[PDB]
Structure formats: C-alpha cells, structure tokens
Amino acid sequence: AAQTNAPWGLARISSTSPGTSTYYYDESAGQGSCVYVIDTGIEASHPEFEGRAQMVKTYYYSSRDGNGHGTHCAGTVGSRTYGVAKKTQLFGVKVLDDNGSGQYSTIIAGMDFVASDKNNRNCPKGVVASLSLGGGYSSSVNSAAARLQSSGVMVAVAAGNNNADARNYSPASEPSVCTVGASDRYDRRSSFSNYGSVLDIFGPGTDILSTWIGGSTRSISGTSMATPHVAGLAAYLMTLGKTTAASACRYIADTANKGDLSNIPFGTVNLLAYNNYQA
Ligand SMILES: [Ca+2]
C-alpha cells in the first residue's frame, strides 16, 4: 500500500533516503495488535481513529484529553491519515493531567495497569505500550517499565528533550525497554534529543503532524513524537509475524537504516527505524 503526501515521518520510516513524501506499508496495517498510549488521554471521538480508540483508565477526575499531547501521540501510532499502524486498536491510559504533568506514583500505577489490563483485551498479534513521558532518574519508575516489558508488552519510551545523556532520565534509562531518540527531516539528530548508550533507536521527532483535540490536527516536536513512530512500527511488525513483544526492539535495531544520521555523539547508536517494506 502507498499513502501519498504523507507526513514526512511516515515516509521516512518506509524509506532508505530522506526527502520523499509517500508512506509504503503492508495493507495488514497492524490489525489484530493493540497499542496502549500512556499519556494525557486520547480524544477517542476524533474521526481519525474510526472507533478504534478507547479510554480504559484514568487517575484524574476525567478520562478526557484536555491537553492534546496524548491524542497527538496516539495519532502517530494509529490514526488513519497520520498513523503508522492504521488498523491497530488504541487504548488510552491517562497518567498525566491536562497540564502534561504527573506524579511518578501515578505513572508507575499506569504501567502496572497495562501489564494486567492486556489480559482483558483481544490482541492476538501482540501488545505495545508507548510512553512519551519522563523525568529525572528513578529506580522505581525504571522497575515499573521493566515489569511491563517482562509481562509481554513491547515498551517504547521517549529518550527526553534535554540534549543530554538519557542515562539520567526515567524510564528512558531502563535498559530492557526500547529507548527512542528523535531525528528531523534532514536526518539530523533533533537538537533537543537526548542521546547516549541507553538509546536503542531513533525515529522522526521534529515537526510531526498528527491529531489534536477538538477534532483538529497540528505539527509539534519532541522525543514524544518519535516514540509513537517506533511503537506503531512494532505493532505493524508484530501483525506481520516478523517479531514479538520480547524481541521487537532488537528486530527494529537489526533492520534499521544504519549510519545515516548526523550529529550523533560518539557512543550513541546511528540507527533510524525502518519498516523494510518492499511492495
Ligand atoms: Ca532494549
């Protein structure tokens, strides 16, 4: 399948070179997989989700996304126009308030919720969790991310926006999950993206168009935006049978475009997520 005039980041993950605008992908499009977006919520009524998104948990007075960040990330995972895995099932877990903030205890509870809740959902091809959030190092936060991965969920986490070594942020610094840095449309490391040996992969993160609240769209930047590209890619690859939740991060790294990014500090992987699709 081919989607013309796609957002640059979708084109980039389906390509060996920058500068094109068509997203190429297998029509299965992540059907039968599930992705949990652990964030500010998801505006499930947005036409772009086509009834495939549901809020399943909140730790606040409402499950509504009053911010937009979570709706944007979910759109990159699985919206019809802006999403990597256009037929996946999206589940929203609101651990961040409408200002985008959250206590670590609430974030931890949200991760352990997903480890259990996946047993309440139909996800024959596998389960992914996308965590476009973080803060300073916390062993408890890292442990929660490791538990979620161990339970059989592919965990993708943002590296952080501190232009610093991600080893000092959580859950970015947990070795067993998939830590995602950000790149721009010219294959530069995004200027804010954290780096370091704990990164596993880069994805598109500068000027990413996706869904927003009020049935709208907008383009924003962050490692928060790169993470759902990798989460959606994992769901897509799991539906195709190419990998599993336990192995997807390594599979993505093994099949990535190698050595094509610029301003990669020494010691950080030079790997850009790639779906390896040949129509
Ligand atoms: Ca890993």
Swiss-Prot record:
Source species taxonomy: Eukaryota, Fungi, Dikarya, Ascomycota, Pezizomycotina
GO biological process per UniProt: proteolysis
EC class of the enzyme, as a word: hydrolase
One cellular component (GO) term of this entry: extracellular region
Cofactor annotation: Ca(2+)
GO molecular function, one term: metal ion binding
Section of the entire sequence shown: 106 to 384 of 384
Record function comment: Hydrolyzes keratin at aromatic and hydrophobic residues.
Catalytic activity of the protein: Hydrolysis of keratin, and of other proteins with subtilisin-like specificity. Hydrolyzes peptide amides
Protein name: Proteinase K
UniProt similarity note: Belongs to the peptidase S8 family.
Active site: D39 (charge relay system), H69 (charge relay system), S224 (charge relay system)
Gene assigned in the entry: PROK
Cystine connections: C34-C123, C178-C249
Species in which this protein is naturally found: Parengyodontium album (Tritirachium album)
Binding site for Ca(2+) 2: T16, D260
